[PDB]
């Protein structure tokens, strides 16, 4: 009757398996025999659902009820979904067994301290799951009374003592991104324990989630929720993976364990749930982030059942979180602005396309196309200065089609190629393009009321070399340049334009180099290209070059070590 | 790429696509350390919603009509609940990841011009799941391609299926319903419920809950002014006592376990009870009803080959039945729903004289039952109307009242013996006590009093049990209905000493001559009578009787010559 | 063919009965390599109404009465949805048909006149269902048998059931629940859910789902103005806090495999639990009321006979009960609801004066607890009313406040000590635990004059006689009282008029002492006192301790000479 906890008022769980005195056999038993499989189950809900409180007069019914929902699992809103246990037990030959169901409750105490001494307990039982106990009996054996009978409360399982005083380089495109970040997430504090059985050796239990109610609990988080409403992140969920059902569920779950004939085991359920990362990444920085928890299908948890007798260490709450105990994820699927316009290009492009800019008025907005064959196309605008961005519908071309024509399939799901999302920077993509499928372009917010076009154009020559690179348009003075544009992910690329300060055929002395990011380079002289080098690593490199005066060449880079979110030539 | 002809077809590409980016939106199942972990699905309300993808050349209502009449009903399948179910175990000190999603059938419709596919609508109809498993470390690195799908695929092998879009019967006369076997399905998957495929180690089950009892019985006849599907109905439910049709409470489920070294795929279908309703006349079938009663399902199971074969393009099958369960062949007569059923309700004794009422040239049948077991000689005034007895199946089982008839409303019965047919005759044949017996008189032409005798035989006349007698002129060629293998048929004839010569014509008979001094005496045994050549003196001025036993039955009607 | 008297009789032919024609009209499944073919059905709406046949001696009323009066209420029972399920797996590389049927109990209403059936009605209740299957090939030519019968025929044994148609109790007086136990049936089938034949080698289950959760208790009386039905089912919460009467929520069922050489059968019954609420007064019964709670049931599993041998002619058994799970007496006391119940609300420590008020002379409780766990010697007045203390099973497991009483509404009592004899002198020395909640019944008085009720903890010799009555005592001699059960104890006080002294009892068997008087100081140990004729200041007060072993009688009696 003696704790060490500081004088005041605690939230105290004794954990899940106690049983109630002199209440063991008023359910009802099963008799098998000769070789018989009894099963014998439950569902809680309605009445068996109910929990039964004893206040003090310090601790009333609601005082106990709001502060163990406020620390421990919410019981009253998980008391509304049907949640079914069973209990498998087989009789040996010319043998009678006998099993009898019982209720387990998770007690819950409201205690004061004063002086190092309990001076005050509230007890409350919710009920969670049953407990079957069987025995095998012969006519006229004199059963013991305990197997029948309890006098005092116990815990079938061993007891706790839970208290709580009363008072890495993204490489991405700037935009929206939806991460499957993992299953099987559950929560601290056993806030989403279905229950646990104790399965007493050669018998069977099983956690039965029957659909009986049609409903499930997403939990939701976000960091501005003007922006990233619990709305905005289901349609954005919707967008990228397709999720059309959140708070209503129609999978079925179960988890069943038979135990050795040597040992006790016990089993826990948890409702798991599936996190979701809304993120809005610009400028190489998180700016917004929004997490969502879809409920997933449940973990079970299978462990030998401890001695009811051991020590118990008194252990204070773990602070509010998650675990997950599902295997490592994460799927990024960038997803469309729902706050941009999206043009069509209906017919598909062939060989020449000049796109004519509208009721747009220098606001970012998409273009959605594709090509009636596949090939290198590359893709520019009037003196490349607005710098666009390619991107690709996930999982087009593979339904209803029309030749020559573009299907809309109506994808938000999109995956970056190449692009510079830079205000002023000449560039132009060289972008390999399959036959079918939908492709965006993201044309910049502009400043200028001119006039604008995009244009598409069939590579049928050694400009094939660039694929899938956007290139960079260079200015030069010989000295110092330095030119800073964001880092492609590993294995892509990135390509640059420069002219060396009169054609004669006179040279020069040119070093190339990148800082804090490793990538083979290549180079090519122009518009027909003929290789110069293979294998240029430019981290550091001090090499140097014959350049001739007043030519045109190009740097392909293939980033190798990614280091730096941008990615800096000179 | 293609190899069909100018025009519009309907293509099938199968069961278990999965969709693009929706692998885990269901949820997923942790397990540990011998745990087994059991997840499925009911598909009802939005879980049974297809997903049209039109094109300016179809419509949705043009995919929808000419995808169900080629192939199977979706809307009328998808409002029956079907549920379906994978099982895993986890071993020990291990942890397994289980994720489920929905198999869809993937349907196309396709225009071809100039061997090219110019147009291609989809219409993805919800099937079944599939469980993808996985076991996995703390900080173990997951391929993504296990977790994401980037392009629709088939779990399964894709298939291409298009189309263009544009015996010696010995029965009476009477009805019979005719049970032609159980496990029968439609060509062209057109009664497939899904198809699962089952990871190796794991086990998947298909489950047909009655969550809504209706059933969809399909019903053909010849001639629906008399055989309409009422009637249909009604006949069945006299012969076999078939009473719930539109209904069914029975469950069926079927569940696989894969082996640990193959990932093995069931197929489930509806299946139906053939029954057809026959109007056997004169010889030939004049008019037929099939009906075909919901059955309790098939199941086919199979390795599940590579999904990475060749396709080889197919044109469906035509419109049509196939039988999965065992050969049978039940016939039960029925009574004639359109005659008059007269009653006995005194137990015959030893004699009778039933007077033919009211039922002026109409056949009918006279319901009794005999006082105590022995054989009974049935006879009409002169013998002219030629009558037919039949035994009630299933007679006698249940209430019984002494030395009283007690109707037990039986329509299935059992002929005996006797003629269709202005054909002199007499049944001799041995009655059961309890049994319940129907005399069809047949319809007669004559306004005259007849009357029905029995008289119990207790004489020589015994040895012609089970048999008909006909009457014979001959002051020489006699043609009757042939009685069935192993059955008999009487003659009974006057000798104009003479050379008698006794032979058959496509039937092998076992003659027992008899001599009637009435006393019975047996002349000559064992007379095979199939164009026998054979010859007996024959008294003048004697009665004598053949009795034949049918042993080869190659005609409809048996011929008898002297 | 008959040997019963001349008259009319009720008879069963048992169940596992299947109907001609109807054979494979409910369906047929078709598995192939090593697949798992389940088929069940559920018996409820129109697969649950019976078949009748009539005579003109016995109409539908006629036979639906008599077989209700004797067999089971299928009326009743028929309204409960049960389940059956059969499970079959098929060879590799091979194809298994099975095809369902519905089983019914066959029953008959006889006319018997000069030994002979001369008149016969049929019933069938409907009952779980029969699952046939069959090894099939292509073109394989199945006999006709298989699919078809002709004649209705019993898939188990027939039978033919007629029936012609026209101990020292230690207790303390108050109020008992004893758990009798649990697979209580009824005879002659009266609670047989159904049978089901299982084919060797496959699976057979009866399934009690709860689609109406309704139950029916049964209840039996010899008092129905003081032991009702609602009276009985209070007492049944005060004791064992059953709740939920003619209502349950849990599922039951049973599945049995039949090996591949053997056919099995497997019979399901409703069970009850028995409970029996008692009024023990004065060493005997006054008042009974037996209670049989709807328990999960009961399945008995036999070999398959064969469905034919010699059908033994067998009167129906007398009505009546059956045990069929282990033996169980489980007594628990619980408080009379027709007696005050007074309360104590702050803790007694070391000396508390209870003052009896509004209960004039009527019995009553007092509901009280102790500050810590120690010996406390409970007195009234000059010892005149002899009190009883109770305890509360399973008090202080919950709420708990320090130094004051926490009233849990146990009515569940456990008797300790105490003489429900007035007029006799005693007080109660017994050792009381420190949260626990305790009950002192006292009896009913005569007397007007105000009376106290004394609490006093022991810290002295006194604490020797723990958990015991003494009893006061003239002696200017026999003794009577009511003997505590086995390994109990009770005290005796007595004065001497030296001089010779015997002690002895009669009908028991008692281990004494004889502690000296206040400080007590032993001076005989182990005195064994039935008819025992051993002996011994003058003067001097003397305490006789006696620890029943044998219980012979009731009452103990003991002698001082």
């Known amino acids: 009757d003696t704790i060490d906890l500081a004088d005041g008022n605690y939230v105290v769980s004794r954990g899940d398996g106690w049983i109630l005195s002199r209440q063991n056999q008023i359910l009802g038993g099963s008799v098998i025999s000769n070789g018989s499989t009894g099963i014998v189950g439950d569902l809680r809900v309605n009445d068996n659902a109910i929990p039964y409180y004893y ?3 310090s601790f009333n019914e609601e005082y106990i009820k709001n502060n163990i929902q406020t620390v421990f699992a919410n019981f009253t809103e998980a008391n509304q979904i049907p949640i079914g246990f069973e209990f498998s037990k087989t009789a040996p030959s010319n043998k009678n067994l006998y099993m009898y169901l019982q209720y387990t409750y998770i007690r819950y105490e409201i205690i004061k ?129 397709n999720v059309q059902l959140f708070n ?118 998409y273009i959605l196309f594709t090509v009636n064959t596949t090939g290198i196309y590359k893709i520019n605008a009037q003196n490349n200065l607005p710098s666009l961005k390619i991107y690709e519908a996930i999982g087009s071309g593979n339904r209803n089609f029309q030749s020559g024509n573009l299907c809309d399939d109506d994808i938000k799901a999109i995956n970056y190629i190449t692009g510079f999302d830079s205000p002023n920077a000449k560039s132009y993509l060289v972008v390999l393009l399959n036959k079918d499928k939908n492709y965006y372009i993201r044309v910049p917010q502009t ?12 590579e049928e ?43 004669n055929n006179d040279t020069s002395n040119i070093r190339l180099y990148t800082s804090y990011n490793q990538g083979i380079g290549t180079l090519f002289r122009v518009y027909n290209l003929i290789n110069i080098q293979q294998n240029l690593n430019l981290l550091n490199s001090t090499k140097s070059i014959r350049l001739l005066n007043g030519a045109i060449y190009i740097l392909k880079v293939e980033v190798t070590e990614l280091n730096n979110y941008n990615i800096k030539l000179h």
């Open 113 to 241: 301290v004063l002086q190092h001494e309990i001076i005050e307990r509230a007890v409350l039982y919710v009920p969670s799951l049953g407990y079957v106990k069987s025995i095998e009996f012969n006519p006229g054996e004199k059963i013991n009374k305990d197997f029948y009978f309890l006098t005092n409360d116990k815990c079938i399982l061993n007891e706790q003592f839970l208290y709580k005083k009363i008072l890495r380089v993204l490489p991405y495109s700037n935009g929206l991104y939806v991460i499957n970040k993992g299953d099987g997430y559950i929560r601290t504090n056993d806030k989403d324990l279905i229950g646990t059985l104790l399965i007493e050796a050669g018998s069977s239990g099983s956690i039965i989630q029957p659909r009986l109610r049609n409903t499930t609990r997403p939990l939701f988080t976000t960091s501005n929720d003007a922006k990233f409403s619990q709305q905005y992140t289901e349609e954005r969920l919707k967008d990228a993976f």
């Open 447 to 458: 400043s200028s009321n001119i006039e604008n076009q995009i244009k598409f154009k069939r």
């Open 461 to 503: 020559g050694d400009l094939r070399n660039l694929m899938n690179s956007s290139v960079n348009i260079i200015n030069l003075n010989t000295g110092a340049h330095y030119y800073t544009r964001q880092s492609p992910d590993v294995h892509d690329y990135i390509s640059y334009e420069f002219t060396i300060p009169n054609f």
């Open 248 to 365: 209503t569920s129609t999978s079925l779950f179960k988890f069943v364990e038979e135990a050795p004939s040597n040992k006790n085991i016990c089993i826990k359920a948890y409702n798991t749930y599936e996190k979701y990362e809304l993120i809005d990444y610009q400028n190489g920085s998180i700016v917004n982030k929004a997490e969502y928890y879809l409920p997933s299908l449940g973990y079970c948890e299978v462990t030998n059942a401890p001695s009811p007798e051991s020590e118990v260490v008194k252990t204070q709450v773990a602070e509010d979180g998650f675990i997950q105990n599902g295997p490592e994820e994460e799927i990024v699927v960038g997803v469309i602005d729902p706050s941009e316009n999206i043009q069509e290009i209906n017919t598909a492009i062939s060989d020449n396309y000049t796109y004519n800019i509208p009721i747009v008025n220098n606001n970012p907005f």
């Open 55 to 57: 206040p003090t007069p």
